[model samples]
Target chain A: MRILFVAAGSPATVFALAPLATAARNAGHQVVMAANQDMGPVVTGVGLPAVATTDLPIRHFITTDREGRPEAIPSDPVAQARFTGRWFARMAASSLPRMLDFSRAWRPDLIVGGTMSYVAPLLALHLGVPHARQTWDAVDADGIHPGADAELRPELSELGLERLPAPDLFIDICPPSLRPANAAPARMMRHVATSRQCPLEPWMYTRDTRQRVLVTSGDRNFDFLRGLAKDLVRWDVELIVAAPDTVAEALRAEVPQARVGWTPLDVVAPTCDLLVHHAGGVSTLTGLSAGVPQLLIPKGSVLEAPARRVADYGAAIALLPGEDSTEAIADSCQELQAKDTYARRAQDLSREISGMPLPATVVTALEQLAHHHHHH
Target chain B: MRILFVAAGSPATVFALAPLATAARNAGHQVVMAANQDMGPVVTGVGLPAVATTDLPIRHFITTDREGRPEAIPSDPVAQARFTGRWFARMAASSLPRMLDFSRAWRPDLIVGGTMSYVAPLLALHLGVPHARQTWDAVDADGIHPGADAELRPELSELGLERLPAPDLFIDICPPSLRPANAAPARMMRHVATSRQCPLEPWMYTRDTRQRVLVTSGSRVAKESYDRNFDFLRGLAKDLVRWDVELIVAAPDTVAEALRAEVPQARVGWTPLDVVAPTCDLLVHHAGGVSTLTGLSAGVPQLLIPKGSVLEAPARRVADYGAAIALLPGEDSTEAIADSCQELQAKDTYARRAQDLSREISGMPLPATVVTALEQLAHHHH
Candidate 1:
């Protein structure tokens, strides 16, 4: 079966789906990645043939107030579902015609996508094909685009589904231990290949790390990671900043350490006592896999949920971008260092994710699902 | 065993070994991809944790001419191997010290690499680790730098080996039928993913043809040569009735709308050769390693029209073996492309031999190769 995977978003979103795509290809199935033009090179870079959706989600209604002032697209939880739906419809209207044409042309039997790729569900509904979602951490499909149909009229009119279809299957790479304390239908697959492979650097081995602290702000730079490494230097820890070379060089003069081009979490986390990072979808999982405690700086409301869940699980101390001051950040960092329970809880969460069914086993089940989920 | 794959060159070189890397990771081995700083991001992008060599070979000796005019890095065979050693020296000097330090720390037991990654074989020797070379389609360790310490001594001397140590084992992904007829010390394994997965385009199922010819210029195509390729394709389009063939031109990916308007009979756009190879009565292409092996792997007779000299040996090797033909583009017209294609199409022995090769590749699937490497090297898996 030719499977269409709708996995376009940021790099983190795309990377999450790669191993499964590899597994499918190795199993001898045709797999195509469909995302916005922004995600095109990224998908192609990993060597998958990517079909481009010309323009997608150029606007975010969440940012617009009732009077409709632009540029405030910050996320709100109850309304977060509304955000996904509105943004999807906006992208779907622009992207749907091309998506439909590509689908009819490629004729995929199954549609699988990561969380942000909402068009897949709508496309599957319209085409009568089976669709599934590979969750992004605690991300489930229940609260999407709260009250979406009215905002999505043009997009809905094209497909003419009474409502968006719920996923026919859900592949959960997150193990039961760390997942949100609720039941969801998901096929447990082993989390495979977190970060791409690179050579192990010297600091990975050489740093004697009496006090190891890893600070990273993933994919994008923000105020949260801003002033973080320098602030981290105040404490007596081996402050390693996982940033790009340019950023690392600049931070190098300040932090007194230089090895900085994306060292793997699996390698470095074992040497660290605490990590201070943006609670990104994968990095958080990597931290959990490493069994390290975190000082999570979650600025986005979407991030707040997982950050809070980690705190709830006793694995972290969550800080908001605006609310948490320097003292608070420092106190939390110190508290995390002193706390024994935090590290222990993180280790348990690590075991939970590590113990999931390997991805290869799920390839067989997903293959069967592809056959079962399709109309023809 | 902690297997460290030392594959670093360009992005293409790094991607070549991903299938085996994936197989290794899937079997639950701790895998690390070691490359220079230049290759770090590329390694991590494919979801493997990349450790960086603070620096690596960034210069090639052949990049400059004799008077140091600095041009004309031609694809002459012996010269090409010499150029490899010279550049390996430049990149190797910067990259070697760090590679040594990282290996000692990571303490890997097995080192796997592709053709351009010379560091791995030497690295294995320095650390007393098992080393292996993964070939590039019908390619083996033999053609590589055949005698290159002359140009690369400064780099090799640091590793302190009397000579470059050969791999304790080597993994061969190419099937016997398609590989060079002479046998070498290698482990025969199934081929892994060459192209990334994508949905099969509609034309794959819908196109009905008694004679389907897929004419493609594999991956690398620059402007002047690209335009010339277009001219040759147009010529073939004009001469199609002489051959009575349904043509598929895969190069000039941007020229699809123009091709539809210009010549409605042919299929266009980038389709994986593997998917289209079975349907193709004949394949016309610039014979790159993966593309060449892919055509042979599908059991389709090939007409190798290559732009580079690296492909010449395989094209010559296949044509002489009776399954293919090699022709120069600028010297030949559409009639040659058409006539050569139809002639190769009509020859039954070509298809039979191609089928034999396809069966051989199928028999040596990658899973067996994985077990072979594991069983022979160390007991990573029982």
Candidate 2:
């Protein structure tokens, strides 16, 4: 089997999909990746072939009022209306040439994509191929974030395709404790309930210390986390901060006493007693997989639901941007590591999360769908 | 009947999808569009709702060699690779967060997309909504371009899907005369036939001109065309040269004419074709969509294949950049214009070309496919 992988920009995207690309390649299938120029080296570095996007002359502009104020600051309904109209028009223009170019260039056997907006469907149609759409986190029927309004139902009427109940074969990489309510269909839940040990063991064993505090902000929020790490260094507990090389230098300079390094999260998260992270879906889930309690600092409203989920599990504490002080870091670390309740409750959720089916199960299901050409 | 339309950054993509979006809305489907920031204005101008893409980061990097030599010198593969790779990575990273953000917001019905790379499939999964993909051109059974070979195969394979047969429905906007051989599929041949008409009617009705020459190099090649236009201006007849004044103030000073006064029978033509290309009879120099489509759509003849499509469409007469003379204020325009007519056979070829493109376009599946997609989405929701 041959597979083409399309990814949005983000090292997490690369990290999340690399394992799958590798797995598919190792299984003797050819795998190729298409992305922006920024991601080409990283994707190629992972051993997958990559292609550059052909759509150039791409432009982006923001509409503002007479005062030069952006119309859609935060979430303005009027501004959103204006923004969506322009956005679709531009997408139609830019994508047409590239689609022509892409369809003209690489024809593949199966298309795999991260949560990009329109690339996947066009490629799928161009190649007349079946595709498996991958998400970094759990999704609901309305396609809203967890705990969102029912009015936000995702529209499927425009494509002339019927909307059915959510599929039972979604590949959720996150652990169950941090998973959204009603995330999986009943059939998928059975698979989740029957699955075994969490996949974070490889990295957990690397920690020499008995009580570990894993620190990370996935990839995007690392810049904001440097001060948080500096505060953690003053504490007596062992601190493990996961970061890439770009920010690792600054982080090391700021917090000399703590161990500041980067490793694939799944490779090194299990041994930790607690996780201090921005509310990125992957990191939150990783903490659950490791059975570690969490200290979450949400960056925006989009993360509110997931943060609530983590807090409701009794496995995590929410830390706002202004509340991240040295004393706060120490107190939380102490409560998570010394207090048995936080750790014990976290471990319980960890057990449930670890029992979920492996991602390979979903992969297998998709492969079968491709082979069969219809839902079973 | 709500519809979500996604478009790549191309004029054709926008034009083709806009009508569909409007049609859906007319049919009482709430329509929302998600696109790049540059396209926001155009979308809203047409009265559709839009969401700006926040997930993809847009960045541009110039590719240079190991020694820092710029790759713009043409045909430098290594420089092209480095440049292409750097840009791809940056764009991928930038687009992810915003796309995820949008998905959490304006949840649409069926996602309709034109030629974006990874967005449609990903959004479909994240939204748990079905999506219909739109194509602007044809792909082979293996999903490869005609000129692609083994070395390019791996790079092309990144699209990540099996090659199925081409869709039975598509709209081929390309005119028959401008189309390269095998550029479109057999299914698209019928539509190309019906789109043929006299290209000069709009100009004739609006401007009352008999002897008119259209000048343009399409949109992309406009920069390359300014010099070519000056060259053609120098060769045109003095009567036509004087007519150039009507098109631009600069044309009056630069062109030589038998009379400084305006001639009622003559007119120099220039207008953005969507608004203006329907009026010209003889199109001179540089084949471009603005020229090709406008000429074909309105029924006019083309003089030369613009640089971009020239390499692809070999059948068209080539406009040699060095051979053409620059237009000057005091130059004799008539002799130069007469010299260009040496290849009158080329003009005939343009007419035949237009007819062929009309045949292919008329046979296209755009309307049927769009209807199918709408029905499918309505069925899903019902």
- Which candidate's TM-score is highest? 1
- Mind giving the per-residue lDDT tens digits that candidate 1 earns over A279-370? 45454766776678998887556677767878888998988767577889889989888888997898888777767776656667777776
Candidate 2 C-alpha lDDT tens digits along B1-382: 4456775433333444554554444333445666555555435433345456532223221233323445343334344333333332223234545665655554566776653323544566555666665543321112222221222233324534332223222334343443446544532311111111111222322444344455443432122211234444433434455444223111222231322244323343333343233344455544422234444444455454233221222213222211122222333246644544433323456445454543444444434235445666548654
lDDT agreement of model 1 with the native = 0.65
Across B1-382, the per-residue lDDT of candidate 1 in tens digits comes to 4788876555445556766776566644577787666666557655566776545334333354324456455467677545555555445555667778778878786888776567777677677777777765665334445444554565567766545656676777766654766556677666643443344455654456558888765442222111125556766776765667777876545665567677766767766555666668788776654666777767789888766445566667777767778885464566777788767888788888777766666667554236346536855321
DockQ for each model: 0.22, 0.01
Model 2 chain B lowest lDDT segment of ten: B190-199
- CAPRI band of model 2? incorrect
